PDB file of C-alpha atoms in Angstrom:
ATOM      1  CA  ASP A 204      50.702  34.552 -76.625  1.00 54.67           C
ATOM      2  CA  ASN A 205      51.610  31.380 -78.754  1.00 57.18           C
ATOM      3  CA  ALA A 206      51.449  27.684 -78.784  1.00 55.15           C
ATOM      4  CA  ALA A 207      53.776  25.544 -80.715  1.00 55.88           C
ATOM      5  CA  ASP A 208      55.235  27.720 -83.715  1.00 55.03           C
ATOM      6  CA  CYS A 209      57.529  30.552 -82.410  1.00 56.15           C
ATOM      7  CA  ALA A 210      60.740  28.464 -81.407  1.00 57.72           C
ATOM      8  CA  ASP A 211      61.420  30.716 -78.253  1.00 57.79           C
ATOM      9  CA  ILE A 212      57.928  30.843 -76.604  1.00 58.42           C
ATOM     10  CA  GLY A 213      56.251  27.609 -78.010  1.00 57.10           C
ATOM     11  CA  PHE A 214      55.513  24.718 -75.887  1.00 54.40           C
ATOM     12  CA  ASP A 215      57.341  22.253 -78.118  1.00 54.16           C
ATOM     13  CA  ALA A 216      60.726  23.955 -78.286  1.00 54.66           C
ATOM     14  CA  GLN A 217      60.609  24.762 -74.383  1.00 54.12           C
ATOM     15  CA  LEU A 218      59.730  21.373 -73.218  1.00 52.69           C
ATOM     16  CA  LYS A 219      62.149  19.890 -75.741  1.00 57.16           C
ATOM     17  CA  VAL A 220      64.936  21.786 -74.101  1.00 56.81           C
ATOM     18  CA  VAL A 221      63.784  20.548 -70.650  1.00 52.87           C
ATOM     19  CA  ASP A 222      64.033  17.200 -72.289  1.00 51.93           C
ATOM     20  CA  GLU A 223      67.584  18.062 -73.434  1.00 49.32           C
ATOM     21  CA  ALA A 224      68.436  19.378 -69.908  1.00 52.49           C
ATOM     22  CA  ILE A 225      67.231  15.935 -68.528  1.00 50.68           C
ATOM     23  CA  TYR A 226      69.134  14.282 -71.212  1.00 53.29           C
ATOM     24  CA  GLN A 227      72.543  15.599 -70.641  1.00 53.56           C
ATOM     25  CA  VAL A 228      72.254  15.794 -66.828  1.00 50.52           C
ATOM     26  CA  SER A 229      71.444  12.166 -67.386  1.00 50.11           C
ATOM     27  CA  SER A 230      74.247  11.758 -69.849  1.00 53.19           C
ATOM     28  CA  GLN A 231      76.861  13.360 -67.265  1.00 52.16           C
ATOM     29  CA  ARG A 232      75.500  11.306 -64.637  1.00 50.97           C
ATOM     30  CA  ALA A 233      75.860   8.264 -66.951  1.00 51.36           C
ATOM     31  CA  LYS A 234      79.332   8.608 -67.581  1.00 51.46           C
ATOM     32  CA  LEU A 235      80.323   8.789 -63.911  1.00 51.78           C
ATOM     33  CA  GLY A 236      78.646   5.684 -63.100  1.00 52.92           C
ATOM     34  CA  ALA A 237      80.771   3.736 -65.756  1.00 51.22           C
ATOM     35  CA  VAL A 238      83.802   5.739 -63.955  1.00 51.62           C
ATOM     36  CA  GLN A 239      82.634   3.899 -60.723  1.00 52.06           C
ATOM     37  CA  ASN A 240      82.922   0.616 -62.559  1.00 49.03           C
ATOM     38  CA  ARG A 241      86.436   1.599 -64.122  1.00 50.07           C
ATOM     39  CA  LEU A 242      87.532   2.149 -60.493  1.00 48.65           C
ATOM     40  CA  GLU A 243      85.973  -0.907 -59.031  1.00 50.60           C
ATOM     41  CA  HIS A 244      87.570  -3.255 -61.730  1.00 50.07           C
ATOM     42  CA  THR A 245      90.749  -1.103 -61.096  1.00 48.02           C
ATOM     43  CA  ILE A 246      90.768  -1.800 -57.430  1.00 47.44           C
ATOM     44  CA  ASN A 247      90.428  -5.487 -58.101  1.00 49.87           C
ATOM     45  CA  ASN A 248      93.445  -5.344 -60.416  1.00 47.79           C
ATOM     46  CA  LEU A 249      95.359  -3.307 -57.636  1.00 45.30           C
ATOM     47  CA  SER A 250      94.316  -6.010 -54.933  1.00 44.34           C
ATOM     48  CA  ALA A 251      95.495  -8.957 -57.316  1.00 43.54           C
ATOM     49  CA  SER A 252      98.779  -7.248 -58.534  1.00 43.35           C
ATOM     50  CA  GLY A 253      99.207  -6.062 -55.131  1.00 47.06           C
ATOM     51  CA  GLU A 254      99.125  -9.549 -53.648  1.00 48.41           C
TER      52      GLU A 254
ATOM     53  CA  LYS B 153      43.435  32.014 -80.273  1.00 49.37           C
ATOM     54  CA  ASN B 154      42.509  28.241 -79.912  1.00 48.73           C
ATOM     55  CA  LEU B 155      41.975  26.281 -76.760  1.00 49.64           C
ATOM     56  CA  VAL B 156      45.220  24.250 -76.960  1.00 50.71           C
ATOM     57  CA  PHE B 157      44.964  21.677 -74.376  1.00 51.32           C
ATOM     58  CA  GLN B 158      47.999  19.670 -73.222  1.00 51.55           C
ATOM     59  CA  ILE B 159      47.049  16.062 -73.471  1.00 51.31           C
ATOM     60  CA  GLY B 160      50.289  14.220 -73.670  1.00 51.13           C
ATOM     61  CA  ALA B 161      53.781  13.946 -72.104  1.00 52.60           C
ATOM     62  CA  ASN B 162      55.508  14.952 -75.324  1.00 55.20           C
ATOM     63  CA  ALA B 163      55.436  17.691 -78.069  1.00 55.57           C
ATOM     64  CA  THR B 164      52.386  18.263 -80.234  1.00 56.50           C
ATOM     65  CA  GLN B 165      50.372  16.001 -78.312  1.00 59.88           C
ATOM     66  CA  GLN B 166      47.563  18.546 -78.063  1.00 61.77           C
ATOM     67  CA  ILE B 167      43.983  19.239 -78.945  1.00 65.21           C
ATOM     68  CA  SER B 168      42.672  22.361 -80.406  1.00 66.14           C
ATOM     69  CA  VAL B 169      39.266  23.630 -79.423  1.00 69.89           C
ATOM     70  CA  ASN B 170      37.006  26.751 -80.523  1.00 69.71           C
ATOM     71  CA  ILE B 171      33.617  28.272 -79.472  1.00 68.28           C
ATOM     72  CA  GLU B 172      31.669  31.152 -80.022  1.00 68.65           C
ATOM     73  CA  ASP B 173      28.189  32.540 -79.286  1.00 68.80           C
ATOM     74  CA  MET B 174      26.669  35.565 -78.018  1.00 70.03           C
ATOM     75  CA  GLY B 175      23.440  37.747 -78.679  1.00 73.32           C
ATOM     76  CA  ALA B 176      24.652  37.707 -82.351  1.00 75.30           C
ATOM     77  CA  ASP B 177      24.708  33.931 -82.764  1.00 76.87           C
ATOM     78  CA  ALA B 178      21.780  33.706 -85.354  1.00 76.22           C
ATOM     79  CA  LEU B 179      22.622  32.810 -89.154  1.00 79.19           C
ATOM     80  CA  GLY B 180      25.887  33.491 -90.791  1.00 74.12           C
ATOM     81  CA  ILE B 181      28.058  33.442 -93.613  1.00 71.20           C
ATOM     82  CA  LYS B 182      31.256  35.033 -92.524  1.00 72.37           C
ATOM     83  CA  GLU B 183      29.541  37.544 -90.190  1.00 70.08           C
ATOM     84  CA  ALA B 184      26.237  37.056 -89.161  1.00 70.06           C
ATOM     85  CA  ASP B 185      24.307  39.583 -91.557  1.00 73.16           C
ATOM     86  CA  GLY B 186      22.867  43.066 -91.274  1.00 74.85           C
ATOM     87  CA  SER B 187      19.130  43.246 -91.101  1.00 77.18           C
ATOM     88  CA  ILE B 188      18.953  39.721 -90.382  1.00 73.96           C
ATOM     89  CA  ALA B 189      20.672  36.869 -88.819  1.00 76.43           C
ATOM     90  CA  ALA B 190      21.846  38.580 -85.672  1.00 76.40           C
ATOM     91  CA  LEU B 191      18.940  40.657 -84.450  1.00 74.03           C
ATOM     92  CA  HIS B 192      16.885  37.652 -84.953  1.00 72.34           C
ATOM     93  CA  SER B 193      18.743  36.593 -81.708  1.00 75.76           C
ATOM     94  CA  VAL B 194      19.389  40.301 -80.461  1.00 77.77           C
ATOM     95  CA  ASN B 195      16.077  42.149 -81.484  1.00 80.27           C
ATOM     96  CA  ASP B 196      13.645  39.388 -82.443  1.00 83.75           C
ATOM     97  CA  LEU B 197      11.134  41.260 -84.404  1.00 85.39           C
ATOM     98  CA  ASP B 198       7.721  41.264 -82.946  1.00 85.17           C
ATOM     99  CA  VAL B 199       7.417  44.683 -81.617  1.00 83.62           C
ATOM    100  CA  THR B 200       4.696  45.748 -84.088  1.00 83.49           C
ATOM    101  CA  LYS B 201       6.628  44.290 -87.110  1.00 84.80           C
ATOM    102  CA  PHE B 202       4.536  41.174 -87.992  1.00 82.07           C
ATOM    103  CA  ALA B 203       0.877  42.842 -88.157  1.00 79.88           C
TER     104      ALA B 203
END
């Protein structure tokens, strides 16, 4: 139908929103790595204070 | 109705191509013309019409 200039069937918008999906699944997946860093540093605190 | 090719991994990184010809591909201004300029590639006078 159309190429780049319809905002709901144009390639640019569609692909852009795929890039958003990748960006925010990447964001959500990027929070939780930092959460794992929080918990590792935590366990170090817990072993030290524990001792 | 261009020939939008996708050329890049991002938006608007595309090439537009057009093409035309058929029996009426002789001279032209916006259309070919009437008595001339298409039938010079469809009818091609010399039936008796040079003598």
